[PDB]
Amino acid sequence: RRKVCYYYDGDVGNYYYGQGHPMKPHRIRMTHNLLLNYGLYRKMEIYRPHKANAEEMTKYHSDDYIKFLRSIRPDNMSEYSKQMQRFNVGEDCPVFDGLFEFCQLSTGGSVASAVKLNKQQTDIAVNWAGGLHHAKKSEASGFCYVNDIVLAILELLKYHQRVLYIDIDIHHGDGVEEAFYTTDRVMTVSFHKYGEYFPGTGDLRDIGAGKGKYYAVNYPLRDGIDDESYEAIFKPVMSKVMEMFQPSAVVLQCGSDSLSGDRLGCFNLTIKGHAKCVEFVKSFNLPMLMLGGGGYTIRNVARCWTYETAVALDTEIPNELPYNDYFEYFGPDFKLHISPSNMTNQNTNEYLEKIKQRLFENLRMLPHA
Amino acid sequence: RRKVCYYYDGDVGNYYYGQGHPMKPHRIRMTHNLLLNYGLYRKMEIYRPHKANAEEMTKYHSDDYIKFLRSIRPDNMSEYSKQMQRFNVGEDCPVFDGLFEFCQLSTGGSVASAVKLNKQQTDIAVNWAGGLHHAKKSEASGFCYVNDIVLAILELLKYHQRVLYIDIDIHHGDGVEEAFYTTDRVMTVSFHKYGEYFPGTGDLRDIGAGKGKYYAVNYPLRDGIDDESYEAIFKPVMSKVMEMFQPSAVVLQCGSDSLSGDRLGCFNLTIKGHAKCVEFVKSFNLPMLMLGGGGYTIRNVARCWTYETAVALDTEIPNELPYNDYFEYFGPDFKLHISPSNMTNQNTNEYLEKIKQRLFENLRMLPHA
Amino acid sequence: RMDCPALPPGWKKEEVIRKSGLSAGKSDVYYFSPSGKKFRSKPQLARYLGNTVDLSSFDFRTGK
Amino acid sequence: GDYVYFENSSSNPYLIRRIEELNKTANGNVEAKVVCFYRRRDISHQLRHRELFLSRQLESLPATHIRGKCSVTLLNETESLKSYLEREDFFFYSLVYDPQQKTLADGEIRVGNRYQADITDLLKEGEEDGRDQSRLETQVWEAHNPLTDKQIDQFLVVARSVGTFARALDSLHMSAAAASRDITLFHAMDTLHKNIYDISKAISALVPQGGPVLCRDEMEEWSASEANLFEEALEKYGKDFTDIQQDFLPWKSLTSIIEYYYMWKTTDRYVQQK
Amino acid sequence: GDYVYFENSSSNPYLIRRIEELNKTANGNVEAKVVCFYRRRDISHQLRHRELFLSRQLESLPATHIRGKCSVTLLNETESLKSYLEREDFFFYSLVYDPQQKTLADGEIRVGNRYQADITDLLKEGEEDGRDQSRLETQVWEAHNPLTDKQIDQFLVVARSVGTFARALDSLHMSAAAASRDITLFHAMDTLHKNIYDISKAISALVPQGGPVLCRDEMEEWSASEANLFEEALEKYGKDFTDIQQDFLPWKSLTSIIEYYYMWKTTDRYVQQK
Ligand SMILES: O=P(O)(O)O[C@H]1[C@H](OP(=O)(O)O)[C@@H](OP(=O)(O)O)[C@H](OP(=O)(O)O)[C@@H](OP(=O)(O)O)[C@H]1OP(=O)(O)O
Ligand SMILES: O=P(O)(O)O[C@H]1[C@H](OP(=O)(O)O)[C@@H](OP(=O)(O)O)[C@H](OP(=O)(O)O)[C@@H](OP(=O)(O)O)[C@H]1OP(=O)(O)O
Ligand SMILES: [K+]
Ligand SMILES: [K+]
Ligand SMILES: [K+]
Ligand SMILES: [K+]
Ligand SMILES: [Zn+2]
Ligand SMILES: [Zn+2]
């Protein structure tokens, strides 16, 4: 049974994005705490990630974008406003006390774990803080400041010829896509809502460019997708992907805003369905790096990643939530699982099979025997 | 440093002699408990004594005296009254529930320890329950029903040619004396009040009989004896005793009613003085068997034997009494030591030296080179 | 009424707490013969029993 | 149920409509009741050239207005049409449009040096990555221990008991619950790992010199009056935690106020819900 | 200060007195003031033949009454007198006797088969005593342990903490004190010895299956109403513990009532003293 490494820094739950802001880092602390009380903590190798310095963040980002982040504060907020606009820091990506500390922990977790995978001293490595996939080389976007994912992947390329990147998050993983848009060594597959939704990118025809053409897979989706519909379009596509792209290390971003009843999301997935993807990936027995990502009904974010951690340990846990410091957060029910809503699935079988086929064609263009 | 074995059965504190009766077994439990909290318990080998059966009690006593004790109860108290008078069970030796159980524990402790000494697997052995020295072969007397001391000594004779018996108790140790009155193998030395006092025996001229003549030493005393007077007459006499009687095992009865402010006693000794005797004996490095005996101001009985246990371990203890279940018993002071009273010492130097000399003569009659 | 084992068969002792006055809370001790006659002191009890028992060392209060 | 091409009176392309009812009056004049198909402009690109939207707009016009018959197909049937059978007459619909409301069933990726990442070259079989692992992580729990679940569980109970006995030395159930909170447990799992999973050694750690250890989270640790301050600052500044500190709890560090907040949200005496 | 022999008017032995003052009147008659020495009979055997007691009785009688002079020595000086110097004239005193009040400073050993013990013969160098040590004792604490004072001390703290946490699971200071009583400690020292002084093994014993252990002495264990019964039975029957059971607590065993008694005597709310 696969060996799992879990990365966590106690401080991460305590950093705060701002009044009225949906991204709430505290959800990782909630997970952490459930893991301890579900007895899972016990069963995996627990690491505190040291802070990632500007040194390794600039391995992808601008020497003067990170410089800006290292420097900016809420003190000198009116002094910098020039650079604030050039870098996207505001309306939905606030400045906030500790921001750079927050980035260092998220990035440290992902990088440390990548190394751990390259050093071949784990099979799976988990960092729920990480997964922040909207970030760009020279600007912040969609609550993401540093793209820990890219940096993580860049380290893996040192030992792995082909790195597969899978993205479940309801929002299209454009940061990780754009960063690797012109390379054939990394294939970015993404399943997301599309049409009057952020980030506006990742439609059927977004295939890549140059050497990276036919290496950026996307599955655009409308509202209300079931576990059943999602499963029936994830497994086929990913089996082909493995078949064709034949990777040697997987990085699964396990965005939890694709769950039902999310604050920002509009999909109808249950923890069970959501996790079935993690389990399917894990089954392909490749060095795997689970990251988190979005998720804005934190009670369920907690539930999800707690459950999905169990999946990486292939151990059973009861629906009965164990007592914990935040036990009272979990409704009148205090259960682990969520059920789907009456919400209407506007992804007709006809619409999913059209897209599926188009992708199967795209994937066939890769070399094989 | 000498090895010590301590014998105790939790039940012993709970047996009760009767309303208005001075002998209170609970004082041993008080000691036990101090020993634990003074940290001494820790430092010695602690044994629970199994119950001594009629088998080994009849090794000295009547087959039908023990039979009587095994049988008698407060139920059949009016049925037996015939035998009650023949055996002395009444006015100051009540019948009481558990009586025979009590005897078995007191005797078991002394016998087990004697064996332990014979088996050469201890240097000192301590049984505060024991020491009950007024008992006779065919009758109870002075709160004593079974003479554990004799039985103990009888076992020691199996490996030891000469057994010395020393008795500090304020009352003359006539049970142990009478039992060995005609033998030269056991010498019984006793320091006690005399003249209108119990048991009426043990004056200067009580020397023994037959083979046992010049082998029963006695020191008669009046009221109010100091530590200073007592020390100055104990050491000289005992050094001669060792000199002459040359024993190979000592049994020191450490009666605590010779202390100051006893309910029944009228001597003016402090724990310090009282213990100086135990320390002096111990110094002669012989297999030693410390027993208790009388003592009727139980707060001080507790103090004494706790202290004297330390002496057998030659470890220091503070005057500060440690907290314990019965801590509140110990006055406003909560100290270990007692000081002597203004009470007048009617043992003039002239009177002590007369007696001393007479005894030195008696002891000279023994064989030597 | 408790059997007093040190007296002959059938003799009993009872202790009664005073409920009020000068000695509220103190007690009095009584003995009863087998027929139920009540005695209130050592000399009264010794006069009744005569030479059938020796009470010299008998503690009237404790019955021992 | 047929679809027709009506007069466009402006000179422009024909208006398309579905025939709901064909009516002839007494004087033999023929009029038709027709549901309107709206053009994408008129609905006031992913929209194809021949998109038409089925409206809730209903009109009646004489039969002379009809200039031709047409087919407005389903989307699937339009896409299936062969190149030869492609005509002026073929249109399609996939949307219903409310004309009164405006209602309808229910952003660029860049290329260049300033967008893509420089791809890190695969290391030679002789080359080494040169990464100091102690600068990156520090382990907090090994998963392969000489200990069994039972023993760890047991130790956790012990770690809890000490904690309760600790806070008894300066409410019983309260102290026990206090000692049972996660901070104490986490500290118990570290105490194990720091002591190399030696139960006997780890227990010394918990009672260093005969004295127990206390772990209190920000919830338990704050004074009555600090707690009070917080409930005034919240009810007054909402969830603005920098101002809540500046003006109400300036001696506390922001991040401790955050940790407190979340712990306080589960408070019993706390009832914002009904 | 001299001692004299006065007339005995009855014919009997002379009365002895100490001369306090010798007086002569104007007519040359001589009278003496004299403190009486009382004979042992007159003081109304350990008393020797020549015992005399110094009284507080003072009388005055003429000098013609004096028939002889004597010595009334100290006790030590009488006992030191030689056989030749023994006389009718030598007496002694060791007691002061108040004549008015009556106040005064402030049994056989047998021989035979039915008194002495049969002396147990010394065993031969080949003979063995034949004594089964398990039938005589069972060990409860070894004094030479692989453990140090610190570790035992520490374990005792732990044993106490469990106990407090045990009674928290069905007053904080009260439960801790309750758990700190001797019974719990003694049980802690046995738990060690039973587990062969293995700290790690012994701690399992204290938390058998994740659940702690409770040791309660009779003090703590009795119900409120049993405690109540006891304070009625005592105040009513004094310290007569068989009747206290028979009539007040008949479901309890005598020996538990004893153990309770002594523990109760230290009670705080208990104040028999002033
Ligand atoms: O404390 P915050 O991080 O600001 O989040 C709270 C919190 O949501 P979470 O519990 O999911 O963190 C409230 O939930 P409760 O405290 O009521 O359980 C929620 O209230 P509702 O769940 O009733 O919406 C409230 O939302 P709102 O401010 O709209 O009342 C929302 O604050 P934010 O909306 O600022 O995140
Ligand atoms: O409980 P018991 O075994 O019968 O002994 C008590 C007890 O004496 P100890 O404390 O030494 O056992 C009393 O002492 P306190 O409870 O008052 O501390 C004492 O009272 P005094 O010390 O005030 O004399 C009392 O004696 P009495 O009955 O004369 O009041 C005496 O009972 P006994 O005399 O029956 O032994
Ligand atoms: K996605
Ligand atoms: K690509
Ligand atoms: K003696
Ligand atoms: K003798
Ligand atoms: Zn998202
Ligand atoms: Zn005595």
Author numbering:
A (entry chain E), B (entry chain B): 8 to 376
C (entry chain C): 149 to 212
D (entry chain D), E (entry chain A): 9 to 52, 101 to 160, 162 to 163, 165 to 228, 237 to 340
Could you share sentences copied from the article?
The complex controls expression of genes through two distinct activities: removal of acetyl groups from chromatin through the action of a histone deacetylase enzyme and remodelling of nucleosomes through an ATP-dependent helicase. The deacetylase module from the NuRD complex contains three protein domains that control the recruitment of chromatin to the deacetylase enzyme, HDAC1/2. Using biochemical approaches and cryo-electron microscopy, we have determined how three chromatin-binding domains (MTA1-BAH, MBD2/3 and RBBP4/7) are assembled in relation to the core complex so as to facilitate interaction of the complex with the genome.
To understand the relationship between the BAH domain and the HDAC catalytic site, we prepared a complex containing an extended construct of MTA1 including the BAH, ELM2, SANT and GATA zinc finger (ZnF) domains (residues 1–453) together with HDAC1 and MBD2. A direct comparison of this map with that of the MTA1(ELM2-SANT):HDAC1:MBD2 complex shows that the central portion of the map is higher resolution than the first map and that the envelope of the complex extended, with additional density at either end of the HDAC1:MTA1 dimer. As would be expected, the position of the modelled BAH domain is such that the carboxy-terminus is close to the amino-terminal residue of the ELM2 domain. Importantly, we were also able to fit the BAH domains of MTA1 into the cryoEM map - even though this part of the map is comparatively less-well defined, likely due to some local motion of the BAH domains. We observe a striking arrangement of the BAH domains suggesting a potential mechanism for binding to di-nucleosomes. Strikingly, the nucleosome would be positioned on the ‘top’ of the structure which would bring the histone tails into close proximity to the HDAC active site.
